[PDB]
Design a protein around this ligand. Structure first.
Ligand code: 5AD
Ligand code: MET
Ligand code: SF4
Length: 258
């Protein structure tokens, strides 16, 4: 019914906890991605979420825009979403592709710009929060629903974001407990080592209680992510958050799900 397509692993940020790291530079040929997306449509997909990696990095966002247009215009998917760090989104992308996009979720873990910088949620300019605010205004002007995703971690577990989130008035505020995935952000050879970012379930629940007045908050605990977050990787193989499947481009959707 719903799928997270991490179609690229390249990114311009350096988030210390990143759980889907730059292990490859492979992106499928556009027509191959279209072929697999059609299979998903034929298997009953109704909601697609483009992720990564940074979705807007590949071909300056043009690759992503073509797949978004394909999903809306050719596959007639009623819900097409992107999750992005926001830093590379050009207004021209909205002009060219925004009519095909339902939802843009921007990842922002703190409203203290210095906290984002220290976490690696940036590329040096230390203006990640201010960019989030501009993207809100573009979503309003181009009629795209705006969501914000935050990873709750050691450095923001005590932050009060109530007034900041209410002022941004997002459709949904998705709040992820920092998640460890072996081979991604855990291991001597991993590109990231996220252990120092982790928080306990009790700490996570405390953050949620602090923000109980935010009615658009939606929590994503570790257990929820393990139970319900499905990944389609850059080869269109299925992965979970707990070897990859065969690619749907080889064995089809059904055999790949097992
Ligand atoms: C796809 C979503 O995953 C979030 N994200 C990135 N790394 C982690 C992690 N270690 N734990 C939980 N969420 C994470 C991104 O910030 C984005 O919002
Ligand atoms: C592993 S996160 C992938 C989506 C995007 N890079 C973000 O952080 O919002
Ligand atoms: S979590 Fe950070 S480093 Fe990882 S892909 Fe998203 S923006 Fe890039």
């Amino acid at each position: 019914v719903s799928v997270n397509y991490h179609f690229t692993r390249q990114c311009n940020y350096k988030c210390g906890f990143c759980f889907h790291t730059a292990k490859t530079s492979f992106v499928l040929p556009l027509e191959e991605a279209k072929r697999g997306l059609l299979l998903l449509k034929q298997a009953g997909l109704e909601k697609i979420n483009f992720s990564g990696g940074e979705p807007f990095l590949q071909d300056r966002g043009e690759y992503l825009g073509k797949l978004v247009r394909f999903c809306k215009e050719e596959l007639a998917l009623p819900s097409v979403s992107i999750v992005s760090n926001g830093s590379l989104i050009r207004e021209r992308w909205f002009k060219d592709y925004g009519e095909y996009l339902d939802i843009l979720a921007i990842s922002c873990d703190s409203f203290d710009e210095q906290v984002n910088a220290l976490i690696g949620r940036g590329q040096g300019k230390k203006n990640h929060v201010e960019n989030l605010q501009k993207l809100r205004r573009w979503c309003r002007d181009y009629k795209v629903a705006f969501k914000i995703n935050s990873v709750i971690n050691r450095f923001n577990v005590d932050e009060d974001m109530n007034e900041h989130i209410k002022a941004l008035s997002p459709v949904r505020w998705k709040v992820f407990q920092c998640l460890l995935i072996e081979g991604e952000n855990s291991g001597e050879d991993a590109l990231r080592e996220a252990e120092r970012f982790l928080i306990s379930n009790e700490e996570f629940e405390t953050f949620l209680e602090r923000h109980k007045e935010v009615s658009c908050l939606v929590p994503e605990s570790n257990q929820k992510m393990k139970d319900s977050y499905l990944i389609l990787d850059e080869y269109m193989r299925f992965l979970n958050c707990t070897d990859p499947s065969k690619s749907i481009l080889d064995v089809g959707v059904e055999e790949a799900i097992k």
